[PDB]
């Protein structure tokens, strides 16, 4: 009837090497218990050598409620259970399973003598960073208990000690803002080590760091010029004693078989040129290099606040076909972001070639809109039996493989051959289905997006020359992301970086983050709104004060000190603006040349902004502030209407996006005047066959402005569209993600003639929340939910539908059907410590108050 589920640290999965001394503790419930909610907790920590301590708390709180004991040092592991009491004194938890908390490396001392390392190679001038293999030989002849290895690059790495891999993190450290914040991984390395002689190998490689990054053929060293690696390895004894083995230049390096390995244009790996037993004990290393020292910064080294990248699946081969030339195309079924793993044997000094691409055209892969980044791995064979490869410092994003070389020797099929999924391990939470096949897929599809673009950073798209962590795209998605999977950490970590970016850009936020671009960005609107929204979206979904407050900063200096204004107040109309990018009447080559006023739309997300911080600074209780913005928002809504809307309620351009705007953002001067906006847009999405309108300031809230007027129906309309341009378009057309055009792909199968086209993007992908919210029913009434709204509202001739989320708390979910006006059925589970408002759908439906359990609802005769 109810248990602990999970505690957790902070938003970590798993909690070693943290930064906090004094981490937040969160439980999860799971159960069916009826109307239960918490009146007490005990925490009981555990530290070596100690009796355990409990601590009680009279509290109702089960997320991020203070660490009770006192601080966490370095290297300092705590286990910890939890149990909870229930409201009335019936039903309480089990002490819950053990876990670990265990702080990193928080100071520069407590790096001991480890310092960035480089090879006696000299680096390569304006060309790619071939990479480099770094070891070290060491003793442990004492008997240990426990051993931990604190490891980063400037670069890429990956670490073996006695030829095992330590852990299973890739692409790591990931992409940070470098020069302000660089992390670096802990690993519990105890079983890898042995009694006597050891080895540690690191190979690493540019990476982000330094390697060729960016549009238009990019640059190169942004970061540096130079492959590094600092690494700390400390055994404690059984004693309680430490050996120490720094990073230093007692090290030796050398190139191996990588010849180069690159994010964009990928792996050529010479096979031949293996060392084998390098990362092991009496090695020849005749022949190695020396290494150096790197000047460097220990101050900017942090602790992850999210989970790392890793390989989360593998994606079988679905078809191997000939093209349309002949040549051996492989088609995983699925657009999918990360690599292939192959088993092969062949002819010594044979290469295989490895082209990936999203898409076919004219009977060929298409490499075309890849632009400056070739995604071509090769393998050059060793003829020493079968082998196994992965690449080790690329990524791809790609559904089709064009194979070049491969050997007779072995079959080209899924025995030899599979795909790597590759992304941020973050916790998934969010499900969604129901009866419309195309709709259910289209769900699919996003999850498939946001899979393949959250990869160490929220990128635009994973395949081409780009793959950036643009700040609009990410605005207008959080609300759906955050409800598939715990983006909290993640998106943490990101937002630290945007503010440490906009205070090198006079309070402006640069369309990137990490920004490769410099200061020469105006700034936007939407984009540069993302340091007010995506911290405002992220405290509805995960309800944390500690992070609001630590992203307040960011938003208010955009409001005060970023935007960038006319006479009253509102935008400078001689501003650079982004606005509704890529409406599907922009032209392909100019897709910021929208139906609606680049002012209009800016304008707008100013109101909306200054809403967003009134309303942060009160959840932080800065009454000045709230206040402040409050009155801002209403002079700023005169002006806007003043600038906007003419004295009878029209808008200066009747669009899809021109009229959703101040509809959502509630600019209208009377409610009479939003209900007939309300009325005309719903007109000129009839007259437009239902298809959408909205490019990417319109589309992420298109679906809830129609449902917040009651329009419902109307949106169904639309999202059962298959014509182009529309969601199930992409989807018929077998698109297994969102694309970044509406028609990214032509009706023929033709590719769209932009330079700028991508099938991986998620902002399309925004409908996601009206799926999650509105055929499913769920939002968060309170931030975090721990209060839920379940009001489903059928439509668009669907018989059922199931929605499921893992809030805070535990699973919510709904499950509805129709059948016998027509007999409504819902299901409504609600989490242990939650409470629920369910509003019963048709005219005077029925809202319910509830507590935990699952509810079942029987509506007979809605209308
Ligand atoms: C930031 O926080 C603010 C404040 O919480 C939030 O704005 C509110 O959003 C809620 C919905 O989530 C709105 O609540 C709805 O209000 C409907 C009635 O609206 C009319 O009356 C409002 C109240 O007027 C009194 O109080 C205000 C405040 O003290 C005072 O100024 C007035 O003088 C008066 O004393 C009034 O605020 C509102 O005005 C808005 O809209 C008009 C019309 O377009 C516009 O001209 C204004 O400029 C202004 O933006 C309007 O006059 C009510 O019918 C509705 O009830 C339905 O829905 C609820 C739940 O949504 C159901 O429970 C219910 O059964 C009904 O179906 C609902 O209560 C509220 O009006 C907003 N308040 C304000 C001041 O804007 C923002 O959304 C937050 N921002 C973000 C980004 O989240
Ligand atoms: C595979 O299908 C392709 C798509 O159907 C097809 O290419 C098409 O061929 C037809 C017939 O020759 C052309 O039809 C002619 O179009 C012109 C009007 O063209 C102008 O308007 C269209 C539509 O613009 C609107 O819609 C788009 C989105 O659909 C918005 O981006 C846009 O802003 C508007 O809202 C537009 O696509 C055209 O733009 C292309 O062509 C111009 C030059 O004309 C270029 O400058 C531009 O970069 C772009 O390539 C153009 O602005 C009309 O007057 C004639 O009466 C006739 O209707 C289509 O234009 C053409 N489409 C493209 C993209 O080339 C391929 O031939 C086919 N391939 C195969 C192998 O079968
Ligand atoms: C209520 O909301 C408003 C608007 O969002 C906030 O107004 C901003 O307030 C800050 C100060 O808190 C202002 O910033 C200061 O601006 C001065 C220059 O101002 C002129 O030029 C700008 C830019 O072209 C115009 O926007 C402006 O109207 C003026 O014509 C600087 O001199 C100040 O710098 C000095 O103080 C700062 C500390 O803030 C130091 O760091 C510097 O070293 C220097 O000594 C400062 O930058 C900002 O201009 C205001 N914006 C607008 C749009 O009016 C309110 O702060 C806010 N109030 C509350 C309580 O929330
Ligand atoms: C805070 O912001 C300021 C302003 O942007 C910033 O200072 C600037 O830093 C950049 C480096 O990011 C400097 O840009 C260099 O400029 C020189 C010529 O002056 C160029 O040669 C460089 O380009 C070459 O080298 C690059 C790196 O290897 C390659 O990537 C590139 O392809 C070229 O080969 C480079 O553009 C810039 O000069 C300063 N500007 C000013 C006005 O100081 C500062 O670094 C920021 N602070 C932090 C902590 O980030
Ligand atoms: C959207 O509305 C704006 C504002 O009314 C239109 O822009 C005006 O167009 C007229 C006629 O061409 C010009 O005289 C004004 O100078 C324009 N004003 C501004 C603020 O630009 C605009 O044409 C409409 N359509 C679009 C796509 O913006
Ligand atoms: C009145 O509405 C019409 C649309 O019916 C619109 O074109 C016109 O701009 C409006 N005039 C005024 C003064 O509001
Ligand atoms: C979609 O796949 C089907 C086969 O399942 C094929 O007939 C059709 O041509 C494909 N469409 C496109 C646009 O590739
Ligand atoms: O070229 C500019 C665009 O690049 C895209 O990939 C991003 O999706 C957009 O945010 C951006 O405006
Ligand atoms: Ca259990
Ligand atoms: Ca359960
Ligand atoms: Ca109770
Ligand atoms: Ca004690
Ligand atoms: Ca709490
Ligand atoms: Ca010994
Ligand atoms: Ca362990
Ligand atoms: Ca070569
Ligand atoms: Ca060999
Ligand atoms: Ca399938
Ligand atoms: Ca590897
Ligand atoms: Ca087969
Ligand atoms: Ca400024
Ligand atoms: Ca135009
Ligand atoms: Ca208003
Ligand atoms: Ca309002
Ligand atoms: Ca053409
Ligand atoms: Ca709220
Ligand atoms: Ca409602
Ligand atoms: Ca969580």
Not at 223 to 229: A, E, S
């Amino acid at each position: 009837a109810l248990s602990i589920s999970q505690v957790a640290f902070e938003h970590h999965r798993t909690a070693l090497g943290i930064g906090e001394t004094q981490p937040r503790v969160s439980w999860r419930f799971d159960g069916n218990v009826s109307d239960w909610e918490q009146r007490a907790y005990e925490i009981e920590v555990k530290r070596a050598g100690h009796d355990a301590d409990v601590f009680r708390s009279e509290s109702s709180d089960s997320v991020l409620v203070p660490w009770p004991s006192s601080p966490l040092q370095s290297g300092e592991e705590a286990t910890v259970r939890v149990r909870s009491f229930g409201s009335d004194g019936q039903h309480d938890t089990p002490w819950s399973d053990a876990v670990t908390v265990e702080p990193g490396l928080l100071t520069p001392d407590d790096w001991h003598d480890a310092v960035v390392i480089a090879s006696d190679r000299p680096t390569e001038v304006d060309a790619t960073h071939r990479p480099i293999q770094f070891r070290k030989e060491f003793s442990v002849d004492d008997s240990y208990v426990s051993a931990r290895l604190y490891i980063t690059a400037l670069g890429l790495y990956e670490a073996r000690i006695n030829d095992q891999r330590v852990g299973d993190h890739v692409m790591a450290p990931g992409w940070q803002s470098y020069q302000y914040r660089h992390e670096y991984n802990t690993y519990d390395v105890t079983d890898l080590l042995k009694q006597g002689p050891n080895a540690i190998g690191v190979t690493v490689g540019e990476g982000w760091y330094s390697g060729r990054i960016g549009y238009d053929g990019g640059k190169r060293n942004i970061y540096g010029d130079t492959l590094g690696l600092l690494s700390l390895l400390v055994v404690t004894k059984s004693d309680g004693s430490k050996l120490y083995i720094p990073s230093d230049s007692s090290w030796k390096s050398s190139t191996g078989p990588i010849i180069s390995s690159e994010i964009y244009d990928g792996e050529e790996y010479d096979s031949r040129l293996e060392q084998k037993g390098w990362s092991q004990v009496g090695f020849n290393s005749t022949g190695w290099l020396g290494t150096h020292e790197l000047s460097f910064p220990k101050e900017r080294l942090a602790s992850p606040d999210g989970p790392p990248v890793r390989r989360v699946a593998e994606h079988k081969l679905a078809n191997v076909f000939s093209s349309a030339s002949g040549k051996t195309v492989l088609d995983f079924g699925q657009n999918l972001v990360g690599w292939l793993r192959i088993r092969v044997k062949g002819p010594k000094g044979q290469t295989i070639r490895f082209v990936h691409t999203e898409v076919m055209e004219n009977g060929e892969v298409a490499t075309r809109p890849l632009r400056q980044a070739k995604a071509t791995d090769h393998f050059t064979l060793s003829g020493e039996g079968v082998q196994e490869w992965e690449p080790s410092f690329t990524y791809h994003g790609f559904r089709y493989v064009q194979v070049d070389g491969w050997p007779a020797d072995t079959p080209l099929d899924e025995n030899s051959v599979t795909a790597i999924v590759v992304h941020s391990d973050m916790e998934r939470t969010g499900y969604f289905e129901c009866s419309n096949p195309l709709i259910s897929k289209l769900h699919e599809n996003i999850l498939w997006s946001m899979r393949g673009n959250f990869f160490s950073i929220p990128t635009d798209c994973p395949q081409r020359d780009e793959r950036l962590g643009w700040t609009g795209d990410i605005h207008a998605f959080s609300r759906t992301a955050n409800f598939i999977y715990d983006t909290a950490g993640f998106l943490r970590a990101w937002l630290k970086d945007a503010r440490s970016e906009q205070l090198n850009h006079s309070y402006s936020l640069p369309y990137v983050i990490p920004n490769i671009h410099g200061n020469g960005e105006t700034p936007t609107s939407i984009w540069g709104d993302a340091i007010v929204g995506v911290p405002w979206q992220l405290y509805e979904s995960f309800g944390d004060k500690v992070m609001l407050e630590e992203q307040y900063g960011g938003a208010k200096d955009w409001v005060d000190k970023g935007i960038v204004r006319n006479d009253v107040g509102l935008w400078d109309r001689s501003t650079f603006q982004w606005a509704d990018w890529l409406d599907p009447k922009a032209p392909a080559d100019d897709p910021g040349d929208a139906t609606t006023n680049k002012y209009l739309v800016s304008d707008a997300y100013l109101l909306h902004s200054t809403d967003m911080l009134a309303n942060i600074s009160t959840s932080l209780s800065k009454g000045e502030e709230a206040s402040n913005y409050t009155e801002w928002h209403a002079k700023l809504t005169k002006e806007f209407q003043k600038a906007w809307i003419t004295s009878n309620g029209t808008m200066a351009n009747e669009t899809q996006t021109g009229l959703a705007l101040p509809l959502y953002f509630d600019l209208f001067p009377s409610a009479e005047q939003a209900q007939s906006a309300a009325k005309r847009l719903v007109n000129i999405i009839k007259q437009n066959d239902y298809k959408v309108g909205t490019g990417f300031a319109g589309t992420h809230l298109l679906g809830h402005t129609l449902s917040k007027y009651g329009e419902s129906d109307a949106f169904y309309s639309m999202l059962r569209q298959t014509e182009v341009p529309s969601w199930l378009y992409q989807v018929v057309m077998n698109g297994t993600t969102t694309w970044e055009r509406w028609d990214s792909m032509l009706p023929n199968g033709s590719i769209n003639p932009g330079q700028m086209t991508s099938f991986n993007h998620y902002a399309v992908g925004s409908v996601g929340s009206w799926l999650h919210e509105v055929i499913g029913g769920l939002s968060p009434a309170e931030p975090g939910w721990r209060r839920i709204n379940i009001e489903v509202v059928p439509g668009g001739d669907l018989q059922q539908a199931s929605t499921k989320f893992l809030t805070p708390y535990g699973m919510a979910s709904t499950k509805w059907w129709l059948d016998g006006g027509f007999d409504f059925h819902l299901v409504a589970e609600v989490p242990p410590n939650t409470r629920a408002t369910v509003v019963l759908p048709g005219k005077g439906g029925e809202k319910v108050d509830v507590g935990s359990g699952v509810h079942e609802y029987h509506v007979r005769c809605v209308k």
